[PDB]
From a paper:
The causal agent of FMD, foot-and-mouth disease virus (FMDV), is a non-enveloped picornavirus with an 8.5 kb positive-sense RNA genome. During replication, structural proteins are translated as a polyprotein precursor P1, which folds and is then cleaved by the viral 3C protease to form a protomer structural unit of VP0, VP1 and VP3. It is assumed that five copies of this protomer self-assemble into 12S pentameric units, which then further assemble around the genome to form the full icosahedral capsid. Compared to those from other species that have been studied, many cattle antibodies have very long CDR-H3's (third heavy-chain complementary-determining region), including a minority that is ultralong (up to 71 residues). These so-called ultralong CDR-H3 antibodies project the CDR-H3 from the usual paratope region as an extended beta-hairpin with a folded ‘knob’ mini-domain at its apical tip, stabilized by a network of disulphide bonds. In this study, we identify and characterize a novel cattle ultralong antibody, Ab117, that recognizes a non-linear epitope on disrupted VLPs and non-intact viral capsids.
Residue numbers in the entry:
A (entry chain 2), G (entry chain C): 30 to 44, 55 to 85, 101 to 170, 174 to 190, 196 to 209
B (entry chain A), H (entry chain E): 106 to 149
C (entry chain 1), E (entry chain B): 26 to 132, 163 to 201
D (entry chain D), F (entry chain H): 1 to 127, 134 to 221
């Protein structure tokens, strides 16, 4: 639980940016009928800017499951066995019993210093099917930083 | 003793948007490659 | 200390990329996706290197044009290397206009992602070598064979 | 005024891994800089240590708790060629290296309801009985899902040789690499839960001899 | 001071080991048991060296795979050396997982006791050279000829 | 800007004993260590000096005391090609070397009953009479099996040339290498006994010019 | 006479291990009918451990002979003339008039640092036939060290 | 004079299992290759 800064600079954290705009959107209905690997990919944007996404879910003490929320840079496609290595990307876990809310911030990334071109894609995967003992909804809050 | 949760260590400079006077945050490497996670400030 | 997993050590190898070609772009994605160099290159979003091109086969000389130069059938006074013992090895600088090259692109890769163009007197077999290779943003890597 | 030399036989052929450099064409190029770029990694295994990747338990990364009395949720080898590790980044990286040595870290995450607390023990069985009492004399560790739903189980390197072979053929051999297994000590199971398992390279793991598999 | 009977001096020689083979393991027990190098090696229980391989014959190029690599009919981008004047000399580093190799084993020697695998384009004559040999636990040595 | 050279004729051929090294393939390998290993020997003759090996007296290493009056038990040459030395480590090591020079140490061990004490003299007869009186003017020594049942008889190098030839053909030549013989001074023989004889290289022995015997 | 430490380290003796278990077994009847070369090979064991064997014989003042007791590492086979060079291995001599008892200790030896594989084999050879003026028996005491 | 039997010299460190206070034993290089034999302690 906390705030994840993907591809962070080691020197910059030795002992600035901020979110300018805001947005909200529902992604999918988290239900037990979706097994592992139920990907939901959202390209960003839906100016040399870094993104800041706060994916949240509505879960109670009787809800169980796990979502993997990551930001893949230039996700053209995902192969059959590639999902298992998604943790290679700036990612977080949403668990109803641990944090039930994700927050990832990534810098500008590209071949050039100015972008047009979906550089980043927010990917949400259902790592484990939803378990209960009454529906769970996922809402994504996306805000550009340092435009 | 350091006032950070389990698995969190100090010595990480707080990034903009945390309001920590000492500029020391409970940093934690994880979440990908090169990712750094901050959860709160560091108090000594 | 681990040495054989260093990127600058692994990528510093001549990999066979294409066989029996006379004129070809130097797109580093021409490498085989199952070889060591190609597989570890495709496991990174971005990269940068200075290339070495080796042409093996019966050929007299090889012309090389930097990235952005116009494509013409006949090359005159362009960078030309004569073959010695049917081998032509030469180091190509990073001529792309971009700061870094990318294996993937969420737009097929545009034509600007190459190290130039190469023409040969007769068809040759080509080997690529990444000198001082730098890789960025690691990507999923899967076992090529079971 | 002429240096006498002698062109030896045997040297001079085109080697694909020779240390010698070539003659540049445009020798006065100066690319600006790449210092402030993000995500650079100069060592493959450094990526594998900080990026745990999930396991393949019959197409899924999690393990379902069983109501029947067996006390063994899973029993998988520690071989990179095993179908369990097939999808991991380490196995993908191990396919291109002949030999390896070092330790593995296995990460376990519990994704059940917060009300249900379960206690699990992880046992390593060096090259075999499948009981906690016999695993007491062997390497073992126990973690309760009431303090941290995240457990790391370092697997020591106990192979006979200094280095092991990345490529081999052992489906369920008793001496494969140590038979990591997960035991649930609580027989008072309430309902169905899940345990996500992922593996990351240890701080001392080291691959060697890069190989191009043409199998 | 005795020099010509030093282990690091005697074993530092090219010994003919096998003739007219295109693909062969680099086991050090292929040496003739009556030769100087092949008989003093068998007078030791364990040993360690950085082998040098020389191939003589009409061959374009030769390959070499490190110990433990899978055996395949075709080799792509594996360590390859081209012949110069029909001679291919290349230094093979010690590759076996074990700390020391053994001439004998009370358990035939298992396949892990070799310096790799070598495949040639055409059959060649092979010579082995033990660089920096280190013998252990001397064993009985008998006169080869009377 | 080009260094002028000249490829000489005669050099460059493939020598099987050339001092030059080759170009490594994997030049960044580092084998851990062999310092704490046991039994390493860096010199072959050091092994031969510290490891005496038995002689071949018609298939047996010992000598049977004779009841008849001859005062001689054995009379063997000091040649590595002789059938007596055929089974020794020195002869096996001498087969691969063209020349040698130095001294030999002959070890005699008495393996009889403790009650029976006998006195033996060992004589070296340089290149020949077989009597102790004639051996008095020659090199000889005497040891009694009542103090130590272990005797060392150093054989000096008295060959005419500085170095001798390891390979030769002299069955019982009077000038082979010195005709080491063993004499028993006590004619009061009681019963049958044995004398184990072994040879080890002297501290000054030195082989040279390694060769491959293709005889 | 004494204790022999085969393949000992020179530095270790410049100015630890001990026997854990114990065992005894009769090997053969030392009789005059056996000429030179009557080998008796005992594989060990009959864990990275060094061995410690005390071969003893029952001989009186009227008994005469000699036995060569050695520990050959990885003794696959012994050739026809290979017996004469058996002294190249850690060995001791058993003489009825000198010591009538042997004791050899050897360290762990192998390609790897952990063993399964008969690394060591106790070989007893009749150097000289037994002589008398009433049978001689040989008993071997074997004990692992530093298991 | 050194108190060792014939052919035995001091200067050899006693190994475990002899109980010599001075850590000097009547060593003797013999028994094979690299073999070192100890028979008793050394007294000066």
């Amino acid at each position: 639980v906390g705030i994840t800064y993907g591809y962070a600079d080691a020197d910059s954290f030795r002992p600035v940016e901020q979110a300018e705009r805001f947005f909200k959107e529902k992604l999918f209905d988290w239900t037990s009928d979706k097994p592992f690997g139920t990907l939901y990919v959202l390209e960003l944007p839906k100016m040399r800017n870094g993104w800041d996404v706060q994916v949240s879910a509505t879960s109670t003490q009787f809800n169980g499951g796990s979502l993997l929320v990551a930001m893949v840079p230039e996700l053209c496609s995902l192969k059959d066995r590639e999902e298992f290595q998604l943790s290679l990307y700036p990612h977080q876990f949403i668990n109803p019993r641990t944090n039930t809310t994700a927050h990832i911030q990534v810098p500008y990334l590209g071949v050039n210093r100015h972008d047009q071109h979906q550089a980043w894609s927010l990917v949400v995967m259902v790592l484990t099917p939803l378990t209960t003992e009454g529906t769970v909804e996922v809402y994504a809050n996306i805000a550009p930083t340092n435009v | 003793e350091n006032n950070c949760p389990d698995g969190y260590s100090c010595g990480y400079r707080c990034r903009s948007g945390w309001g920590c006077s000492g500029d020391e945050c409970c940093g934690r490497r994880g979440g990908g490659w090169g990712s750094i996670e901050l959860i709160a400030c560091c108090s000594s | 200390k681990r040495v054989h997993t260093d990127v600058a050590f692994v990528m510093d190898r001549f990999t066979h990329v294409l066989t029996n070609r006379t004129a070809f772009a130097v797109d580093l994605m021409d490498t085989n996706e199952k070889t060591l160099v190609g597989a570890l290159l495709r496991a990174a979003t971005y990269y940068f290197c200075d290339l070495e091109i080796a042409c093996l086969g019966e050929h007299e000389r090889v012309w090389w044009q930097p990235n952005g130069a116009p494509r013409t059938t006949t090359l005159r006074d362009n960078p030309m290397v004569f073959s010695h013992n049917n081998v032509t090895r030469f180091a190509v600088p990073y001529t792309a206009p971009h700061r870094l090259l990318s294996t993937r692109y969420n737009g097929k890769l545009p034509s600007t992602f190459n190290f130039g163009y190469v023409t040969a007197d007769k068809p040759v077999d080509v080997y690529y070598r990444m000198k001082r290779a730098e890789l960025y943003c690691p990507r999923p890597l899967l076992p090529g064979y079971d | 005024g002429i240096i006498p030399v002698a062109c030896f036989d045997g040297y001079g052929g085109f080697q694909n891994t020779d240390p010698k450099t070539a003659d540049p064409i445009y020798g006065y190029v100066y690319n600006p800089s790449r210092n402030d770029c993000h995500g650079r990694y100069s060592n493959l295994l450094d990526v594998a240590e900080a990026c745990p990747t999930f396991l393949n338990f019959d197409g899924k990364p999690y393990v379902v708790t069983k109501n029947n009395g067996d006390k063994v949720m899973t029993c998988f080898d520690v071989a990179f060629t095993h179908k369990v590790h097939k999808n991991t980044f380490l196995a993908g990286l191990a396919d291109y290296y002949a030999q390896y040595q070092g330790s593995l870290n296995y990460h376990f995450m519990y994704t059940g309801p917060t009300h249900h607390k379960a206690k699990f023990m992880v046992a390593y069985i060096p090259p075999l009985p499948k009981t906690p009492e016999d695993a007491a004399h062997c390497y073992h560790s126990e973690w309760d899902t009431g303090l941290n739903s995240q457990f790391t189980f370092a697997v020591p390197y106990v192979s006979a040789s200094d280095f092991s072979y990345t490529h081999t053929d052992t489906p369920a051999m008793a001496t494969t690499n140590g038979w990591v297994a997960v035991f649930q000590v609580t027989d008072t199971h309430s309902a169905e839960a899940a345990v996500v398992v992922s593996v990351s390279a240890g701080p001392d793991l080291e691959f060697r001899f890069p190989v191009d598999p043409v199998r």
